[PDB]
Assembly symmetry: D3
Homo-oligomer: 251 residues x 6
């Protein structure tokens, strides 16, 4: 139950990711064999729930690609449920300040370090109590990644970076650019400046910066600035754009 994604971030090894919004355990398996370091199962902007996350985790399990799950909100109940089906790395949207970052961390840890509810007999996470000393080992293998995606969050970044347990800070360019008045097109200089400055500042604190960006030149630029978990495409986009291009070539 060692979290290899978390260890890679701590070691400063960049992790290249693909976003999964197709909400299918079948396409998840297909994509798990494609060579990515990590895969993001999106519970916020794709039609997923705890049950479909579970089946996508099962599909991905035998592959080297490591699963990361985004809940629909920073909700301790939903987080509890996602952890019990076996989620170990969480990307929490709309984290606005250090209190919310601490709340996210706490939701993933058993008492006394947090408020995670105990149900190990029932949980895939413990392999239904086959993992010895699961309750004592689980906290240290949780990896908490918080999203900053408003001006307010950017303003609070220094305090967020002081939060123990926050392993990574992810910048969401679509939401950020919308909040900045450039809906939701992040290519503007003002947005790019905020993004790049945040990446530097995050890495400086010893935490992992992350981002999703479909422009490959920008992705390489962010990696050069020290980003450590960079998602470089989205399954729905890859499929749609490839299919459209193919159809157009035949008139």
């Amino acid at each position: 139950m060692e979290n290899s994604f978390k260890a890679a971030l701590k070691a400063g090894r960049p992790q290249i990711g693909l976003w999964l919004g197709l909400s299918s355990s079948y396409s998840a398996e297909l994509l798990a064999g494609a060579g990515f370091d990590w895969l993001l199962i999106d519970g916020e902007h794709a039609p997923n729930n705890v049950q479909t996350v579970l089946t996508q985790l099962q599909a991905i399990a035998p592959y080297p690609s490591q699963p990361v799950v985004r809940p629909s909100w920073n909700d301790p109940v939903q987080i509890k449920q996602l952890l019990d089906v076996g989620t170990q790395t969480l990307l929490v949207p709309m984290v606005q300040n250090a209190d919310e970052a601490r709340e996210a961390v706490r939701a993933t840890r058993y008492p006394p370090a947090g408020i995670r509810g105990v149900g190990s007999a029932l949980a895939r996470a413990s392999r239904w109590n086959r993992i010895p000393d699961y309750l004592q080992k689980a906290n240290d293998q949780m990896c908490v990644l918080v999203q900053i995606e408003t001006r307010e969050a950017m303003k609070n970044l220094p305090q967020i970076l002081d939060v123990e347990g926050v392993d990574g800070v992810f910048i969401g360019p679509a939401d950020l650019s919308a909040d900045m008045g450039y809906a939701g097109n992040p290519q503007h200089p003002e947005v790019q400046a905020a993004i790049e400055q945040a990446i530097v500042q995050i890495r400086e604190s010893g935490k992992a910066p992350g981002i999703l960006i479909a422009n490959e030149q920008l992705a390489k630029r962010y990696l050069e600035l020290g980003a450590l978990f960079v998602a470089v495409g989205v399954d729905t986009t890859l499929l749609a754009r490839a299919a459209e291009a193919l159809a157009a070539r035949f008139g």
Copy 2:
């Protein structure tokens, strides 16, 4: 992506609806061909979730009947998820005051007009970014309908009617009659008086009144008073009552 239901309300064209509680994409398609102007996919009182709403929207799509979705609560996260799978007209239950009405409206609009989270690459709503300028066009095609269904809500109706974005106000007779002490039988004069007075007052403000009522004589009465979205039956009731009547005719 023009919202034809919203345009019809704004033009003062009454829209006759059927409530869908069978929670099936198959019966939804069957009913989408029955001649109604709108269909209510009930996420509050039928066993639906974001995923079953999605499949019912797909089933209904090629028909003239327009889908409306009721979330289980005025919850901005659930609303975000329903909008991304393509919901454009929302019926929000238990809206008690103008602050809650504003919250409902805000949940459906991208910044700066609201707090809707941005995820268009992943969303059926944008057809996975095939709709050009989706982010700039979406806000104006959202139709927000708020339910008033307690004495408190009735008391706050004048302020609710002053809320920009609130396109329609729906009176829920079952909940209202229960709150008034007539569980949950709305046929009482006191309940009927509150309902009819609200319909007049709503229409007077330039907003659309709505209601669900299975009594067809009452439905016509509400239409005559100026109601513009009137659901006149419920799928589960139509099926159950027709089947029971049939069985009884054969002993």
Copy 3:
């Protein structure tokens, strides 16, 4: 595990049925409480399979209405699977002659009386071996109903009626009328004469006649003539027609 539908046929008590083509465990429960003697889960003309049959059987189980299942064909393998999930009354389509009727019967019976495969530990049918002596008790509680639906089958009816274990013979007016050259018009005199004559011949042979007909006056005629399992409507039709009529009353 007594088959009460079968006992009722044997005692000459007419059983009034409803056809289920909505393929949903949810609407199946709703309809199971409507007062019918039997409900037909249609695996031939509705999108059902062994798994959805199972869930509909579970939904119907606590109600007095008895389930009957129609497989897609007289296929011993499919019949084996349906029986193991708990089907005890089968309506077999397109039975053309006595050999095929015999094969339908043999598919439902364990050796030496038939060729039913043994898997009792796994089967809902035996309640996972909780029913004592299931293997010795099962054969006698199977009820086999065969459909005669062509001119060839009508010719062979006397031989079909002589087959031991054929408990009932069902006339399919839609298929029969199509085979006779009157598609969509079983109301034609030559078709009605064939149907009436078959019903009388079936009953005079000491077996149960059955039919589906949505015209309530014809249903009553068939009951008078001695039909013992008569389906008097179809869920999809009841729902579609009630909905369409409702919408039409409002324009």
Copy 4:
């Protein structure tokens, strides 16, 4: 719609239960025939939602074993949805004080006794309005069981026990032991003392004590102290441990 589990608790008849975390309507039916007085469908620590609770309720319905449902949190919206699909006995986790206990009770009662939303036409709970006077009969057949599972909750137990509507108080040893510093192993004397003292105090108030414990000797000890709803095993554990033992016997 009489709640027989609730009546048994009120009569002081101990009820022996099994926990269901397999989240399957198929295994639920299999286990419903095993002889337990009650079955716990776990929406907090197993991958269930309103829809899978519904199908497990349908599967269990014809058996003598009575269903109890645990929502993922004390959330009035989720409770509303669970009640409409037919839940009558609720086990509410993490109830910390008397205000939260009152909130749980209120969520299950129609006005004026509570805030339960009215949707009986659509609800399996009313059998789609077949149950006469459902709205007037429902409140009295709801059975509310609250979980105490922290030191804080134990401290507030006397006030919780004064709450009308609270029919039972369940002690959760896994969460309690974790909160007490013995994650999450409850066998410690300190934990056992808190548990046994609570059982006595609960029963003394005229309310039903409950607990889940897989150690059968402890279960008998709790029953001897006056516990009235005792779950004595968990489906996932029974299956896993039996399978592991079997494999080990063959090397």
Copy 5:
């Protein structure tokens, strides 16, 4: 219910297709908007059944792309079920001779032209009897495409082409090359010669030639030679290859 794909073939307008093996109603909708003339829902080599075909048909329905369905075999019972859920264009695998081609045709036609079972009240195909005179109109809108995939089938092609109701003949290069002794290598000259010769012979007979080929230059060659329904890619391949290429660009 006009079959526009069939009318296009008859008019000699080439139709460009994409193969759907992702077996998801969600990705089917995404791809239905990509601009293809037709989409092949594969029931032979992807994990589909009648029920998933149904949901994909519903997803595709509002788009201009026309659905074609491949059953797992030339099986009249399976074909009956696919037609009733609304399939009008069928691609039948492993058609070896004229007798088998005739049987494929007869499976799609109501008596006296064929053996299609009648169940219109239940069928999406008739929109549950909403389409007037469905039974008299259906036969003419069925489009039957037969696959020639072996040396034996190539031999029998002239007789297959003489079968009335065979609208198109599709060459399966993967199966054909395997049968010829070049598995996985349809690029071999002897295979290409067989394919080209078949396409010309099919077209000269006044029928539509079809093929699937992922090599875009070969596709263009086949179109030049007169192929009228040409699938130019496969969803699983498009997705897998785009993802793998992306991951490789970042290491």
Copy 6:
């Protein structure tokens, strides 16, 4: 894609199995971690289909336990579909003679060795063409196990054993005992003698004998006699019996 189960049989290493009839990807994972050498996904006597087989294969994949799949019949089309979703070891029921054994083998092999249909781009089996030279490597990793379950099959055993590609012969005691006139009583001496003699004859022929038996002492006897794939229990039974025993210990 090496078949380790097949290699183990060939090397004479006995493989201990558990039967899976719960038809759930969730319980399949739970059981995949219990330490068995193989797990039988039963498509004959449990409510499975190609799609649920797929999800169980995905669940089992990261564990050391090897999956074996039983189709509902010796049906080449069904076998094609099971192989494409990734099945490499097949247990074929009711194989009565050498011709049928040959047909089972041929269904699993690409031409010229067999009649397996080619669809590698679409198949999980080839990991969507990621496995290089899949088409040339697949045949050799198929493992075909045939069931002898009647007196006729026992007669033909010597000829069945002479069929190339038959890797193992499994004796089905429930079906065999029923065919011999001892339904539900394979413990009878004449049945045990037939079983023992078959096991010895199979092994002496250089092939693997198999059987399912829930009596652990008989299992050990069969292993001593040289059986190489022995299933020693069934998930539904393990669960039902453990639950019933538990409930009985409390009254």
